[PDB]
């Protein structure tokens, strides 16, 4: 049982081509969703900062975005992560606020029945 990496330049170009069709389908929105900033859970890397999965419910409510719409404007949700330190709430709320600063939202046509 042996594996060869001859398709390594083939697979990389397939991935790039897979990104370009995604960009074609969804033009204005970025090819990647926003991710939060979290700290690795170990004494070795705890002083580091990296990306998370999504923004917890305290990070959404504090920033001012409901949890239902957040999934629609590209902000992802992590029901499992929680905020134990306020610096973790702060680094990710401002991460949301800077995102909503640059976020153009296209209006959608809405059904308007004659009566009500």
């Amino acid at each position: 049982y042996v594996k060869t990496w001859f398709n390594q330049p083939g697979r990389k170009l397939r991935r790039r081509q897979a990104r370009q069709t995604k960009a074609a389908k969804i033009a204005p929105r970025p090819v990647e969703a926003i991710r939060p900033a979290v700290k690795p859970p170990t004494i070795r890397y705890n002083m580091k900062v990296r990306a998370g999965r999504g923004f917890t419910l305290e990070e959404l409510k504090a920033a001012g975005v409901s949890r239902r719409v957040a999934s629609t404007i590209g902000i992802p949700v992590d029901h499992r992560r929680r905020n134990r330190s306020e610096e973790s709430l702060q680094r990710n709320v401002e991460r949301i606020k800077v995102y909503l600063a640059h976020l153009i939202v296209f209006p959608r046509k809405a059904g308007q029945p004659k009566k009500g």
């Binding site: 170990t42 004494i43 070795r44 890397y45 002083m47 580091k48």
Partner: protein
């Protein structure tokens, strides 16, 4: 009579934890010297440039 066998298990963790921070510090300390230890401009090399 010493700690525990799994308490010496953490002895690597108090040995390996200060690896990443040491390595990151070595990266910036090397770069800091690089800014310091650079050759001056040689003002005679703009005669033609």
């Amino acid at each position: 009579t010493f700690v525990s066998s799994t308490m010496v298990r953490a002895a690597i963790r108090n040995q390996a934890a200060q690896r990443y921070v040491n390595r990151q510090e070595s990266k910036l300390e090397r770069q800091v010297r690089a800014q310091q230890n650079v050759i001056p401009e040689d003002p005679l090399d703009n005669v033609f440039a």
